[PDB]
Design a protein around this ligand. Structure first.
Ligand SMILES: Nc1nc2c([nH]c(=O)n2[C@H]2C[C@H](O)[C@@H](COP(=O)(O)OP(=O)(O)OP(=O)(O)O)O2)c(=O)[nH]1
Ligand SMILES: [Cl-]
Ligand SMILES: [Cl-]
Ligand SMILES: [Cl-]
Ligand SMILES: [Mg+2]
Ligand code: NA
Ligand code: NA
Ligand code: NA
Length: 326
DNA sequence: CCGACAGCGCATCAGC
DNA sequence: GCTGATGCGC
DNA sequence: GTCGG
C-alpha cells in the first residue's frame, strides 16, 4: 500500500470513464496504470518517476504531481460534486445495471437505492437480484469462509457424479485472504472439445446445490456458464452469513489448463498476458492458445498439458497463481 | 502520428 | 422462430 | 490515456 493514494485516484478516474463517459479504453488505461503503480516497490515521489513505468504517460504523470502536492485532484473533486455523475456511478454498483441502464434510470428520475426499491418492475431479473443483495455483494469473503464454501461445493459435486472435478479459481486460487466472490471451474469426462456425450452436466450440479440450499438465486444460466448467489448455512441462534456471488464454468476437460489459467486471473493479468500473446503471434482465450497466421487469422489450437506450456509459448517465465494478482 | 487496445457466455432487443 | 447487434459482467 | 512502428 506504498502508493495507495495514487492507485485509488486512478481507480476512481477509471470508474468515471467507464460508468459516466462510457470510454472503455480510458477505463482500461487508468486500470493498467493503477496496476503497474500498485506493484512498484517504491513510494513514488513524482510524476516523472511514475512516468517511467509502462502504462503511465504524460497525463497521469501530471495528475500524480497534483496529487502529491495537494493530496487531491481537482478533476475528481468536480466529478464528486456533479449529481448526474454521482447518480450514475452509484446505480452502476448494482449488479446488472451498467453505464447505459444507469444513465437511462437517471433520465427517468430513478437515482437512489430507495427509487430502485420502489421501481423493481422496471428492472430485469439480474438487476432485481443485484438490488436485493446490494449490501451483501459489497462485503468481502474471508478466506475461512471460502474454505467452507469450497468444501460444500466439492462434496456436493462429488455426490452428483464422482467423475466431476470442481476447482475454485479466481482470487482464492491466487491465495488471497479475502475474495469478492467464488469462482468454480467444472469439468466432466463426458464433455470435451470432441463431443458432449452427456447433457445437463451444468444443470445437474446447479440443481444439487440449490437442493441443499447453497445456491439461493440465479442471475443467468446457460449450458456452460452459471452466475448466481449462494450462502453458507449458519448455526442455531447464529446470525446468517451474507449472500455471495458465485460463478460456475463448465469447460471441456481437455481444455482445463487454458480454462484454469483464465479463471485464475487476475483480470488485469489476463489482459496483459493475452496482449503479450498477440505481440508474440498467438491468441489466447479460455479454451485454447492458437498461432496467428500471416494474415492475422487464428490457426489450430496448440497442444497444452499445463499452464506453464501456455507461458512457454509466449516466452514468459512461469508465474504461480499467487504472483498473478495485478 | 494514428491504429490498436483480450476475448467471450448469457440476456435482451430489433428486424425479418 | 432465427440472426445479429448491444449491454453486461467477467 | 498510452504505446509502438
Ligand atoms: N473481473 C474480471 N475478471 C475477468 C475479466 N476478464 C477475465 O478473463 N477475467 C477473469 C480473471 C478473474 O480472476 C476471473 C474471475 O473474475 P472475478 O471478478 O471473480 O475476479 P477475481 O476472482 O480475481 O477477484 P475477486 O472475485 O476476488 O473480486 O475472470 C474482466 O474483464 N474482469
Ligand atoms: Cl475510450
Ligand atoms: Cl481527490
Ligand atoms: Cl477456441
Ligand atoms: Mg472472483
Ligand atoms: Na510510462
Ligand atoms: Na453494475
Ligand atoms: Na467471479
Amino acid at each position: 500500500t506504498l502508493n495507495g493514494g495514487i492507485t485509488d485516484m486512478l481507480t476512481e478516474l477509471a470508474n468515471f470513464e467507464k460508468n459516466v463517459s462510457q470510454a472503455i479504453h480510458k477505463y482500461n488505461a487508468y486500470r493498467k496504470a493503477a496496476s503497474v503503480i500498485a506493484k512498484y516497490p517504491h513510494k513514488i515521489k513524482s510524476g516523472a518517476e511514475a512516468k517511467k513505468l509502462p502504462g503511465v504517460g504524460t497525463k497521469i504523470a501530471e495528475k500524480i504531481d497534483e496529487f502529491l502536492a495537494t493530496g487531491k485532484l481537482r478533476k475528481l473533486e468536480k466529478i464528486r460534486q456533479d449529481d448526474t455523475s454521482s447518480s450514475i456511478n452509484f446505480l452502476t454498483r448494482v449488479s446488472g445495471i451498467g453505464p447505459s441502464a444507469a444513465r437511462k434510470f437517471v433520465d427517468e428520475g430513478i437515482k437512489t437505492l430507495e427509487d430502485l426499491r420502489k421501481n423493481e418492475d422496471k428492472l430485469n431479473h439480474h438487476q432485481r437480484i443485484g438490488l436485493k443483495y446490494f449490501g451483501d455483494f459489497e462485503k468481502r469473503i474471508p478466506r475461512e469462509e471460502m474454505l467452507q464454501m469450497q468444501d460444500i461445493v466439492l462434496n456436493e459435486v462429488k455426490k452428483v457424479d464422482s467423475e466431476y472435478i470442481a476447482t475454485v479459481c479466481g482470487s482464492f486460487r491466487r491465495g488471497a485472504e479475502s475474495s469478492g466472490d467464488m469462482d468454480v471451474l467444472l469439468t466432466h469426462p463426458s464433455f470435451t472439445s470432441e463431443s458432449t456425450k452427456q447433457p445437463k452436466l451444468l444443470h445437474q450440479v446447479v440443481e444439487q446445490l440449490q437442493k441443499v440450499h447453497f445456491i439461493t438465486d440465479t442471475l443467468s444460466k446457460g449450458e456452460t456458464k452459471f452466475m448466481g448467489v449462494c450462502q453458507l448455512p449458519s448455526k442455531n441462534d447464529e446470525k446468517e452469513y451474507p449472500h455471495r456471488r458465485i460463478d460456475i464454468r463448465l469447460i471441456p476437460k481437455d481444455q482445463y489448463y487454458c480454462g484454469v489459467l483464465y479463471f485464475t486471473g487476475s483480470d488485469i493479468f489476463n489482459k496483459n498476458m493475452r496482449a503479450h500473446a498477440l505481440e508474440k503471434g498467438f491468441t489466447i482465450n479460455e479454451y485454447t492458445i492458437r498461432p496467428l497466421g500471416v494474415t492475422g487469422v487464428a490457426g489450430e489450437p496448440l497442444p497444452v498439458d499445463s499452464e506453464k506450456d501456455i507461458f512457454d509459448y509466449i516466452q514468459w517465465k512461469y508465474r504461480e497463481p499467487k504472483d498473478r494478482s495485478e
